[PDB]
Symmetry: D2
Subunit: 263 residues, 4 copies
């Protein structure tokens, strides 16, 4: 097992199509002992290979964050610490992402999306670093925001902020001998993405997303399967392992290499 | 016979005569531009400072966090420049982050309300200003924002770095919208300007002049102001959604 | 009143009137610069092309692979501009890659002799020209090279893309040397100037559009870098590509 | 082990301080079966590779020799057995004459020397991939060694230019490798001590470059230790980064993500 004996916190499980669900499944297959967070979820988490305690965590709730380390210690047992943390939380209201014009997103919506998608990566690291072992690893989920694109809109801005937050989290994490990195994935057909392909956002957005995904598989030298999240989950586990011990404040691209090719 | 002869340019962000916006404004006027200035909160203080500029320019109130100020902005600019006239340039020179998110305070101790305020003013407002002003901008027009390279983390800058990373992303989307009006949108990434953390910030500033192949004078905003004017001119007509580094070339050198 | 009034600028790379160097030279003359031109191999043909320019400018021979041409260059430029005068600007607009390293030919089938020739002319020569000309450059001066964004691989450009990646690296080291003379060194990364799908994709991604038949926006960008308006920019790349490189789709 | 049953070719062993020596050692500790390639000092390389955990066949390979490249796949097949293919290829070759790297002014490097350095350090990555892709299994991995050339630095000079060319070559090699279901990536390492031989000026510049790394790296950087770099190469040779290609993984203590 790649993660044999490691105690890992995994956030962001909502459905069995969430990348966190696949990260947690592979982490358990690789011998990790998990602690899960959520804010209904118990039903979904019961579908994982092994039973894991589920803790309540609303990242926008400061009381949940202040009590988190103590609640995790209770779940893993006094004297034990975490070796890993997976931040797999991302949100942007429909005004800031999708069909809505970029200029029509109110700041209250954009701010909510940035709180959950970017700032919470620092919040979780602040709460959990005091109960992390040296050699530990914090991993977040990204979508390459280096270039603008249709529809992603203000979520592109939140991902750009997340990448910046990750570099500062690495500075803090380093004091504990802990690494902090992001996995930039290619398009993933989740419960939300499938509906857009299904035409829930209209024919215009449906065509734009179809062109975005078809372009990915053709640019990716090894191809890209938007229905298979496993290569992304394995990449997160590689960062949670001891096999990338000199990588921190960084971004690993699990995108079929699409970002390295123009056409 | 100036670089910006006949151009109507809005310049936001003048607070003191050491503000980058003050030099941008002085250089633009020396190069024959007609200006419209915007000010936040300290309006009477801004009026006295703008009295030191080469030519008189109308001063308009603009709080970027105020939606009413943004909805009325185009109308108020049109009144100032005259009906039938449009802007050829827009300078966004606004940046703010509370002390909890910038300086000596630990990165982890910044409350989100403070970070959100700083991101609103420093990054989101670039889209707000472009939304308000694009309907009154001429083709061939130029929107310029002020940046500080956030590609790498650094001591003390903390959440302001995060806000600059957001700004660069906003700029790329603003360019998509601006292009529909034949308008460019770009940022000028400047080197440090003198407008435990103290020692780290001092080493950051000294390191700039040594890495910069042409050197860097942190007491001189003029090279930065000239760079903004180059982007406001017709001399970079195929550049948009981009970043021009007026940093002495420091970002291109490791040591 | 021109942007480059009184400036003495060397412009290399004119072969045809469609050369980016030709439009750089035309715009710089329109803007009051006094030019010195350099040409390679087909000198009688280059002279004819340079007669199309607004003003007469001396044409000097320069084969960047010829060490004797490089060792005599400063002396020959000084003869053309007059003793006691120095250059304020240098434009490197030279690029070459044999057909084995560029086009339909498989990436793996390019012999190293061909790749080496292309890298010599397209990348190393930027350092060669700066070495020869910085001793005859004025403070506040500007060296500009022509680039095509090589950050990502693409079909057909193959080994030329590798040569552009080398050029960008060379430019950063040339800036270190140039700075000692108070001189800037930068590249202009242009969009395509007239594979078809690559070129059509450019105008659609560019927020302000891209006209591949028009070299003027690129020529103006080079002149902006030759002017005194970007005095704190060096070892850098300015993108005159309609902003295509900042957009995914 | 991480690389159990995998057949991996490792080039670039010259001394027991070569990053390739450590790559080979970690790969063997992790169950890989190796084929080694050596240049010029073959008898000397044998003495070094006798210091590895297990015995591995050593093949001669001069990357500037087109005959060595044309016969390479056949010679590898003989060493691993007919019907078997490689799952991994490690390019750990770098060279630049002293005229292009060190104390010598950047402008004083003759092109013949720069060209030789680019041939060995950048072009040979495409040469090795061309020779070995026909004898590589799907899911396979090609890894090369890099040093971040995004910014200019003192003394590295023309070797930085060669690394910038290598990164570009890697992106094109990924296009070709993808047709075989093979990944191609580079590992950008921090400085590794592989005295005053360059004088006081260069010595001070190089010392400041190296000390700056450990201070910028949030997890620190041990320039005497190649193991974190060797483990990173093995992570890319494994099946744990299956959607990464034409890319660069930084095993530099995170120094490149920090300004100061
Ligand atoms: N000073 C430097 O070292 C430096 C370096 C690189 C970039 N920059 C950038 O240049 C720009 C100008 O900074 P400066 O150096 O002139 O400092 P500054 O203090 O003079 O400018 C910041 C301006 O933001 C304005 N502002 C704040 N809140 C506002 C609000 N609610 N609505 C409207 N305006 C508001 C202030 O009134 C002030 O004029 C900023 O974006 C800054 O990040 C500065
Ligand atoms: N055309 C485009 O799409 C495009 C795009 C971006 C950048 N550029 C770059 O702009 C530059 C000029 O290219 P262009 O498109 O104007 O084409 P071009 O064919 O007109 O220019 C290439 C020039 O290089 C010269 N040259 C070749 N070998 C030489 C040698 N041994 N010594 C000296 N000069 C030599 C040729 O004589 C010619 O004048 C090149 O660096 C090219 O890569 C072109
Ligand atoms: N040492 C460091 O600080 C450091 C840092 C980052 C990256 N790297 C890279 O790691 C790689 C390995 O270098 P190293 O540090 O182990 O030094 P090294 O000297 O031990 O390895 C370089 C190898 O290249 C081989 N070589 C040279 N010319 C050759 C030719 N014509 N044909 C075949 N092989 C040839 C040599 O025999 C030698 O084994 C290089 O690509 C280097 O740039 C090293
Ligand atoms: C513009 C089209 C829409 C409507 C979305 O964008 C996508 O689906 C893009 C094209 C990609 O498929 C990405 C791929 C991805 C998926 C999960 C984590 N990182 C990246 N999805 C999200 O960013 C999606 N992110 C997540 O589901 C998410 N999940 C866990 C952790 C971080 C996340 O960003 C989500 C925000 O994106 C979308 O909804």
């Amino acid at each position: 097992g790649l993660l044999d004996g490691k105690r890992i916190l995994v956030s962001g499980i909502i459905t069995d199509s969430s990348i966190a669900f696949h990260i947690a499944r592979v982490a358990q297959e690789q011998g990790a002992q998990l602690v899960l967070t959520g804010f209904l979820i118990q039903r979904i988490t019961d579908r994982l290979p092994a039973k894991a305690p589920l803790l309540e965590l609303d990242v926008q709730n400061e009381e949940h964050l202040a009590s988190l380390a103590g609640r995790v210690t209770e779940a893993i047992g006094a004297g034990n610490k975490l070796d890993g943390v997976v931040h797999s939380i991302g949100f942007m209201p429909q005004t800031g992402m999708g069909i809505n014009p970029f200029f029509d997103a109110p700041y209250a919506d954009v701010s909510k999306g940035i709180h959950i998608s970017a700032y919470s990566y620092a919040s979780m690291a602040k709460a959990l670093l005091p109960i992390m072992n040296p050699g530990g690893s914090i991993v977040g989920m990204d979508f390459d925001p280096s270039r603008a694109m249709p529809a992603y809109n203000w979520m592109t801005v939140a991902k750009s902020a997340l990448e910046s937050v990750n570099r500062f989290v690495a500075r803090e994490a380093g004091k504990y001998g802990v690494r902090s990195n992001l996995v930039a994935a290619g398009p993933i057909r989740t419960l939300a993405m499938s509906a857009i392909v299904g035409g829930a956002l209209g024919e215009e957005a449906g065509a734009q997303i179809q062109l975005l995904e078809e372009g990915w598989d053709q640019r990716a030298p090894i191809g890209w399967n938007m229905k298979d999240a496993t290569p992304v989950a394995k990449t997160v586990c590689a960062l949670l392992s001891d096999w990338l011990p000199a990588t921190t404040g960084d971004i690993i691209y699990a995108d079929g290499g699409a970002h390295t090719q123009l056409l």
